[PDB]
Design a protein around this ligand. Structure first.
Ligand SMILES: CC(=O)N[C@@H]1[C@@H](O)[C@@H](O)[C@@H](CO)O[C@H]1O
Ligand SMILES: CC(=O)N[C@@H]1[C@@H](O)[C@@H](O)[C@@H](CO)O[C@H]1O
Ligand SMILES: CC(=O)N[C@@H]1[C@@H](O)[C@@H](O)[C@@H](CO)O[C@H]1O
Lengths: 143, 142
């Protein structure tokens, strides 16, 4: 009424665990692990959603580090999601709960909280989209 | 606040024109036109959103007719979107304004308000996703 997902800063909360998308210590170094972690409201747990101007593609950028949701190597199953100066372009797709986050140039793969594990520092990885709950993210807007 | 697009009944308003997704007289016959039309709040301008259980795919069902966003022939450019007993599976993709509505098994093609034309009874068609504003839809929950 209307429902929109505007460009802005988001807390990203895993549907399965209630844990949030977390950049390891908020560090800017290339390859810094992106993981599930207990929500604490810190900037390393905030992400800027922005459209690139190519189709409906977006990027996600860590507020603390300034680095982007990226990849540890060539995107395929079980590849780590990592903070990177090179953003992996994403598509944000409406799911039965929250949204799926697909790699826009590798659409078979989505951001995946590994094995629905609620423990801190559980890896987020690229994985085949099976539309399981651990592959869905609630977008919580910061106003 | 947690932005969700829940299964529910929706008005879908084209970003470019401001006209809404409209099933011609809410008629249930196969092949009935789906089009842009000025918003009057009637049930033929309301759509049920539901996940099919395959991936993140959904369907859109007209409240008035009970028929679905569908097609009368295989999806390519300028193929018309029509009301049908057989739903075309869809993907709802977040756009810079509103949402794009892709054909789930033909992702290059999205619901498109022809020529960004705000005239009543402008046809909605399947078209090449260019991410133009006539290919984006605002979801108004009721
Ligand atoms: C407030 C803050 O930055 N806490 C982070 C935490 O979120 C997590 O990244 C952890 C490493 O797993 O390091 C901590 O310093
Ligand atoms: C109030 C109402 O239902 N108006 C409908 C309109 O939405 C549209 O479908 C038109 C056919 O183009 O028929 C009208 O009867
Ligand atoms: C015949 C046809 O498909 N018409 C397209 C329309 O779909 C739309 O994308 C528009 C841009 O507003 O360009 C038109 O030429």
């Amino acid at each position: 009424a209307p429902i929109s997902l505007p460009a802005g800063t988001y807390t990203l909360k895993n549907v399965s665990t209630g844990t949030v998308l977390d950049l390891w210590r908020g560090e800017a170094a290339e390859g810094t692990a992106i993981q599930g972690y207990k929500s604490h409201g810190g900037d390393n747990q905030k992400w800027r959603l922005k459209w690139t101007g190519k189709g409906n593609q977006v990027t996600l950028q860590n507020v603390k580090s300034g680095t982007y949701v990226g990849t540890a190597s060539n995107i395929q199953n079980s590849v780590n999601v990592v903070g990177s100066t090179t953003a992996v372009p994403l598509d944000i797709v409406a799911a039965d709960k929250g949204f799926a986050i697909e790699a826009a140039d590798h659409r078979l793969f989505v951001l995946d909280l590994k094995e629905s594990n609620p423990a801190n520092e559980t890896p987020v990885i690229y994985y085949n989209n099976n539309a399981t709950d651990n592959q869905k993210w609630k977008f919580i807007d910061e106003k």
